[PDB]
């Protein structure tokens, strides 16, 4: 069902020539590990959505797992998959009080 | 957790500064106070040369007031020479440390009555708003009370 939804949304993106942003939850198994950043395998367990996605971005906040992290107020955007560009990470300022990300 | 690390150090600092003195006074009061007053009267705060005692009732406050000079004299003889006055208050089941924990990070007194300024800005927006929005903005501005001068 999730795989079909992912395929349909990709078809919708191509049909209307528009970027389609779809939010997804990371698998619960990641919390059992809690030792590294999220990876593509964490999403494969929830409907094989990786195969249809042109771009996969993960949100990681060290302060959530480690309140004494020196990266307080910083959110890491991980590029897990990209068809027309490089993979890597981008650090953004997370302002929870304003529900905003800044450069 | 950062919240937890910020807690204990602050509590220890307060004890080092003055809570230990209060505890010592509370221990002394158990020896000074007569039979049925020992468990109903406690030292609440110490500020400079002033000691604040709390009694469970107004009747008990009167009994403490009778022996107030005796308490003050004995506290001074035992090393609290800085104490020169005692204030006695009535405190029922009100929890001293719990009150501190509940209202610690700034006094939370919410005062939300609307200002005449807000009503003015709401009407200024209503002039540019469509008829449907204009009515709601005027309604909100009408609800805004002030009446100064």
């Amino acid at each position: 069902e999730i795989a079909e939804i992912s395929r349909s949304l990709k078809a919708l993106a191509k049909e209307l020539n528009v970027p389609v942003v779809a939010l997804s939850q990371l698998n619960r198994s990641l919390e059992q590990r809690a030792d590294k950043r999220p990876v593509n395998s964490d999403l494969r367990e929830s409907g094989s959505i990786e195969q249809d996605a042109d771009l996969i971005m993960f949100i990681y906040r060290d302060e959530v797992y480690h309140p004494d992290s020196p990266l307080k107020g910083t959110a890491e955007i991980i590029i897990g998959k990209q068809r027309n560009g490089p993979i890597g990470s981008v650090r953004l300022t997370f302002q929870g009080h304003y529900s905003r990300f800044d450069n | 957790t950062a919240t937890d690390e910020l807690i204990q150090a602050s509590k220890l600092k307060q004890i080092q500064e003055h809570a230990k003195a209060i505890l010592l006074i509370n221990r002394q009061l158990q020896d000074i106070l007569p039979k049925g007053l020992k468990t109903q009267v406690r030292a609440a705060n110490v500020r400079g040369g002033n000691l604040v005692l709390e009694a469970a009732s107004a009747a008990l406050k009167m009994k403490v007031d009778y022996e107030r000079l005796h308490i003050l004299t004995q506290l001074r003889q035992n090393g609290f020479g800085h104490l020169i006055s005692i204030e006695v208050r009535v405190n029922p089941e009100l929890y001293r440390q719990s009150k501190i924990t509940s209202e610690d990070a700034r006094a939370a007194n919410p005062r939300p009555p609307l200002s005449e300024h807000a009503a003015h800005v709401l009407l200024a927006i209503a002039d540019q708003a469509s008829d449907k929005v204009k009515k709601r903005l005027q309604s909100l501005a009408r609800l805004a009370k002030a009446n100064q001068k």
Side-chain angles (χ1 to χ4, degrees):
Chain A
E1 183 180 16
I2 294 172
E4 181 59 28
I5 293 168
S6 170
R7 284 193 295 269
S8 297
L9 292 182
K10 183 184 185 57
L12 176 61
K14 297 183 174 177
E15 179 183 348
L16 301 179
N17 193 23
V18 62
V20 175
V21 179
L23 305 179
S24 180
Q25 292 180 344
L26 293 175
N27 202 92
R28 354 93 204 174
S29 309
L30 182 62
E31 199 60 46
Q32 290 179 8
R33 255 65 186 176
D35 272 346
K36 241 83 178 175
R37 295 182 295 175
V39 292
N40 288 339
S41 71
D42 298 315
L43 286 175
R44 284 249 304 277
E45 221 100 39
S46 308
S48 301
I49 57 174
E50 319 303 76
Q51 60 185 353
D52 303 305
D54 299 295
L55 173 64
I56 298 172
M57 293 186 286
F58 298 105
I59 305 171
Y60 182 79
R61 295 173 60 207
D62 198 42
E63 62 181 345
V64 173
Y65 299 100
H66 304 98
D68 294 324
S69 170
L71 299 173
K72 185 192 194 175
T74 304
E76 186 178 11
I77 307 300
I78 305 161
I79 136 77
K81 180 178 181 177
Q82 193 168 157
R83 297 202 204 162
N84 305 316
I87 63 167
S89 67
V90 174
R91 288 176 181 178
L92 299 180
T93 300
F94 183 68
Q95 297 180 337
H97 297 288
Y98 306 123
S99 294
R100 187 176 182 92
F101 279 83
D102 285 332
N103 193 231
Chain B
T1 306
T3 65
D4 296 302
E5 221 185 330
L6 293 171
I7 289 172
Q8 189 189 137
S10 180
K11 290 181 171 294
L12 282 175
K13 191 189 230 301
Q14 291 171 350
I15 295 167
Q16 280 185 359
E17 279 177 17
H18 81 95
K20 265 175 189 310
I22 294 171
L23 291 173
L24 288 174
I25 290 168
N26 272 318
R27 183 189 75 179
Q28 289 228 278
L29 288 175
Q30 296 173 353
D31 300 328
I32 301 329
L33 296 171
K35 189 167 177 181
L37 290 177
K38 296 183 187 196
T39 68
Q40 300 171 348
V41 179
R42 295 184 185 195
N45 203 355
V46 174
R47 39 211 295 196
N50 188 57
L51 169 65
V52 178
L53 296 179
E54 289 180 344
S57 73
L60 294 175
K61 173 180 180 290
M62 170 176 80
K63 290 181 182 178
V64 174
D65 284 346
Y66 282 129
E67 291 205 19
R68 192 147 82 187
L69 177 60
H70 184 76
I71 296 168
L72 183 58
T73 300
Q74 288 186 301
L75 288 174
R76 285 186 287 149
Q77 290 171 342
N78 294 324
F80 297 93
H82 298 282
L83 294 176
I84 61 262
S85 66
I86 299 173
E87 288 187 8
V88 184
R89 297 179 180 177
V90 178
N91 193 86
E93 292 299 314
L94 294 173
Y95 212 130
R96 295 168 58 248
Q97 288 185 338
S98 178
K99 279 179 297 213
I100 294 171
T101 301
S102 63
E103 210 195 342
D104 210 296
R106 279 95 274 186
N109 39 267
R111 289 185 298 187
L114 211 45
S115 176
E116 209 112 72
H117 176 84
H120 192 97
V121 202
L122 286 166
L123 295 173
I125 301 164
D127 100 80
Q128 306 169 323
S130 64
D131 294 344
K132 292 183 179 178
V133 180
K134 182 186 71 65
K135 287 179 182 181
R136 290 292 181 190
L137 287 167
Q138 289 181 125
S139 171
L140 275 154
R142 188 246 86 159
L143 292 175
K145 274 174 109 66
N147 214 309
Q148 51 174 28
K149 95 180 181 185

